[PDB]
Design a binder for this molecule. Structure first.
Ligand SMILES: CC(=O)N[C@@H]1[C@@H](O)[C@@H](O)[C@@H](CO)O[C@H]1O
Ligand SMILES: [Ca+2]
Length: 907
């Protein structure tokens, strides 16, 4: 081993620790809350760990140690205090016991010990292991894409390039974890590892990587946003996707296969527009069969089998479509010429057709992106420089066949590809790369998709929700996956539920040609197709809210937010009670349907809807039905048309007109859906949607403020839109403004100031008059947040809103202030009254490996059971089952006038 510390000297640029064994480590102070520790037997102490291949030159760190400056180091002292050596500055006391050589860190502003070694660094069996104290309330996140998982206390996770895309695998590892205690750690290695968060000993956390040295960055911070910002300053801020990357893509090969005319009901038969059924054959599987060769452009008596025909199908079905990959398949290619240049020209023609239709082109790549000889290529080589500058390609997907060796391979490849898009375009195209097999740093270039799974199975949704949440907790906000899987299909219900929740996620890939049916939003019956569209249109309408939380994700909280990120004071937000839900940015709680459980009316039964905060009203997005938080709801009846989504009362949600791609967005309009509740605020981000210029200041922000009464209360409402700050290519200064304000009664008065001058508002007599004029207001009892969903579901889904339209104005030179007297948005709050009812009798009076069921005698319009101090409600009968254990059970009844006293604790 290492032995006692004999000494810690302040050398020129770092602190040099000398151990009894003669082994040395360097501590580098980078800022007042971040330090590198490196124990290097070699004594070389090189800046960068050795990659898997010398040609791998992409670095884990995006900022060199020298770019952090010497100041923190200058303001760090080393003292000998008898039993300890101590390094101290304004941020950190870093304390080493001399004999044991154990390190602990005190965070000075908190005046707490955040990190404590409980056993020394071990180098046994060509592995480098740290051992840390784990506290009873300490929770852990990170590791990258940890398939099926986000919260790691009491578990071990593999920091391994597993190439396992299902539950329990790691699609994209990251040697980065953090503690709720207030520390994050990056291990400065390309080597695989294993982190054990007290799987067996719950007072001990061990972190192991293969190899012979120990190199790590420790950062301390009092907020989850600050931990990620530290990881981001260190390894790279996430890339901001272009607008189009938030829209569903279509991925398939259209250059390779043959379609053969077959009987309806033949296995793999697809109906085409000519009324006939065809089966697809790879050229190797065709044998003696007669079929039609596909092409990208459908120029060879083959149009319905083309890539263009798919773009035409998305248009005909009125489905949003952002981007298209037409070479996604093994040996597919993107042309049928005798040359790379011939092929690039065929791709260019497909790109012009796609762009005419508002769709961008990407390429899949199973290989290196450059010819052997760039000036003299071969047919069937790749040339990303030409694909980009001749053919106009803007996006890339990295197949496992390219990046599958993991670790340094993927980051080098993605760093390379990203640099090519920006240089070849002079920054007119920002990177849009979807990858996997990532590492620390990947997020600065690429988002991830979760790989190959089977859809049309509820497990496809169940495992994916925590997958998304953990990837985002690991400093990768750009996360996505196949729409209903690359394999399987034939389950309408699962197909509908997949589109539903992926509305509130970054990247949606229609990964076509391997499944039990085509992979499109229109693969099922009219009902599925009409719900799919409703939910894709809702995403398109939410694009201003979506883009603003994406900008926030570049240097802050990710877009998919673990409940703990938005409610850090609630135990429930940190555990598996939060594994199947999340906040989509600040304002929406998404609790997807993930199983086939139904009542006798055919609705899905949704158990375990965690609504945080006992003081907070939650509003059903679609219906307006209000719910009180501090509770987990069981038995929430969800029909097929619906996915459980609740607005945080107080929310401001920037919206736009429904659209099928970014060029259909009306840039001379702006719209705000608002749920006034005290004083709330939003920062709307925007830029040119496509270039690197956002990195060089070419963006604008608009700050919106709602200053209204409390949930369900009457008062003055003042909505303010502050002057837009910043500019960018094709910025539109002149815009008309809509406010939709959820309200239960017609208001007393509505006035407006624009840049300090009144604007006379007339009251509309009807919806038609309101939607035709401006400088108007209107109390609308038939306000439909999503008309497509009203019409798909067969419900009106009418809410009451106060809607306010202002004429076009300069958003840069003039603010907006709307004032509403007699503003109220009131409905009955479910679980609104938790006050003891004296007149309600306290409730009177199947075990498996870990599923306890509890029963009692019938008082009460429902009951509530407290399960280890967590309140489960909406229990509509006299039994309830609690599972997912390795516990205590107080119940109470619920009448029309509050609850009963809690029964005594049962075990
Ligand atoms: C993990 C992975 O690479 N999956 C891909 C799948 O997404 C697709 O690109 C397919 C070719 O159509 O090849 C697979 O290798
Ligand atoms: Ca094909």
């Amino acid at each position: 081993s290492v032995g006692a510390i004999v000494s810690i000297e302040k050398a020129e640029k770092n602190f040099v620790i000398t151990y009894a064994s003669g082994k040395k480590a360097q501590i580098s102070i980078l800022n007042d809350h971040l330090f590198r520790y490196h124990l290097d037997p070699t004594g070389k102490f090189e800046e960068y760990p050795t990659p898997n291949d010398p040609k791998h030159v992409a670095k884990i760190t995006a900022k060199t140690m020298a770019d952090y400056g010497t100041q923190a180091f200058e303001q760090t002292n080393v003292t000998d205090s008898g039993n300890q050596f101590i390094l101290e500055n304004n941020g950190l006391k870093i304390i080493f016991e001399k004999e044991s050589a154990l390190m602990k860190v005190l965070d000075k502003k908190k005046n707490q010990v955040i990190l404590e070694e409980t056993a020394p660094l071990s180098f046994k069996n060509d592995k480098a292991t740290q051992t840390l104290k784990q506290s009873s309330q300490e929770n852990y996140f990170g590791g990258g894409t940890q398939n099926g998982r986000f919260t790691h206390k009491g578990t071990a996770i593999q920091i391994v390039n597993t190439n396992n895309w299902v539950d329990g695998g790691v699609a994209s590892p990251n040697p980065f974890y953090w503690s709720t205690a207030g520390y994050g750690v990056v291990r400065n290695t390309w080597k695989p590892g294993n982190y054990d968060f007290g799987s067996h000993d719950p007072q001990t956390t061990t972190t192991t990587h293969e190899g012979t040295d120990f190199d790590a960055f420790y950062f301390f911070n009092d907020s989850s946003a600050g931990i990620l910002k530290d990881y981001y300053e260190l390894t790279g801020k996430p890339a901001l996707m272009p607008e189009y990357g938030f829209y569903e893509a279509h991925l398939n090969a259209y250059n390779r296969d043959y379609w053969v005319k077959v009987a309806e009901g033949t296995a793999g038969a697809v109906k085409f527009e000519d009324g006939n059924f065809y089966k697809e054959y790879q050229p190797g599987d065709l044998g003696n069969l007669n079929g039609t060769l596909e092409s990208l452009n459908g120029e060879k008596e083959n149009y319905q089998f083309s890539a263009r025909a798919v773009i035409d199908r998305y248009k005909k079905n009125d489905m949003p479509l952002g981007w298209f990959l037409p070479n996604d398949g093994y040996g597919a290619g993107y042309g049928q010429t005798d040359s790379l240049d011939g092929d690039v020209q065929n791709l260019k023609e497909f790109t012009d057709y796609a762009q005419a239709n508002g769709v961008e082109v990407g390429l899949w790549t199973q290989s290196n992106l450059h010819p052997a000889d760039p000036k003299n290529p071969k047919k069937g080589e790749r040339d990303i420089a030409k694909e980009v500058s001749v053919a106009g390609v803007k996006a890339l997907k990295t197949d496992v066949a390219w990046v599958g060796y993991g670790y340094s391979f993927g980051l080098n490849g993605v760093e390379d590809a990203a640099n090519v898009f920006v240089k070849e375009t002079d920054g007119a195209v920002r990177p849009m790369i979807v990858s996997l097999d990532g590492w620390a740093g990947t997020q600065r270039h690429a988002g991830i998709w979760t790989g190959d799974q089977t859809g049309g199975q509820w497990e496809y949704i169940r495992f994916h929700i925590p997958t998304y949440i953990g990837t985002s907790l690991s400093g990768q906000p750009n996360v996505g996956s196949d729409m209903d899987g690359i394999f399987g299909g034939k389950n309408k219900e699962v197909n509908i539920r997949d589109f539903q929740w992926k509305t509130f996620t970054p990247v949606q890939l229609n990964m076509d040609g391997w499944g039990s049916n085509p992979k499109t939003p229109f693969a099922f019956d009219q009902e599925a197709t009409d719900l799919n569209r409703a939910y894709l249109k809702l995403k398109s309408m939410m694009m201003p809210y979506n883009y603003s939380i994406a900008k926030e994700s570049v240097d802050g909280l990710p877009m998919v937010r673990a409940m703990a990120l938005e409610f850090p004071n609630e135990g429930t937000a940190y555990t598996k009670d939060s594994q199947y839900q999340y906040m989509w940015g600040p304002n929406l709680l998404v609790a997807p349907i993930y199983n086939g459980n139904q009542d006798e009316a055919g609705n899905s039964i949704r158990d375990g809807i965690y609504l945080p905060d006992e003081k907070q009203v939650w509003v059903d997005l679609f219906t307006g039905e209000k719910y009180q938080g501090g509770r987990v709801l069981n038995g929430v009846k969800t029909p097929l048309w619906k996915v459980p989504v609740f607005v945080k009362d107080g929310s401001i949600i920037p919206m736009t007109n429904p659209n099928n791609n970014p060029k259909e967005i009306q840039r001379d309009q702006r719209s705000f859906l608002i749920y006034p509740n005290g004083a709330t605020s939003f920062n709307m981000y925007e830029d040119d949607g496509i270039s690197t210029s956002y990195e060089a200041g070419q963006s604008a922000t608009t700050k919106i403020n709602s200053q209204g009464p409390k949930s369900n209360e009457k008062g003055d409402l003042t909505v303010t839109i502050e002057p837009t700050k910043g500019s960018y290519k094709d910025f539109v200064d002149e815009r008309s403004t809509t406010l939709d304000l959820l309200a239960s009664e017609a208001p007393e008065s509505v006035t407006a100031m624009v840049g300090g001058t009144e604007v006379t508002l007339k009251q509309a007599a009807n919806k038609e008059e309101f939607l035709a004029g401006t400088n108007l207001y209107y109390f609308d009892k038939e306000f439909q947040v999503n008309q497509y969903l009203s019409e798909a579901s067969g419900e009106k889904l009418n809410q009451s809103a106060l809607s306010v339209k202002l004429a076009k104005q300069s958003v840069t030179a003039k603010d907006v202030q709307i004032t509403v007297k007699g503003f109220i948005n009131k409905g009955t709050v479910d679980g609104g009254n938790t006050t003891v009812d004296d007149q309600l009798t306290i409730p009177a009076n199947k075990t498996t490996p870990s599923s306890l069921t509890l029963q009692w005698d019938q008082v009460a319009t429902s009951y509530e059971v407290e399960r280890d101090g967590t309140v489960f409600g909406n229990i509509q009968t006299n039994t309830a089952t609690f599972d997912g254990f390795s516990h205590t059970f107080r119940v109470r009844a619920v009448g029309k006038n509050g609850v009963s006293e809690w029964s005594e604790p049962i075990k």
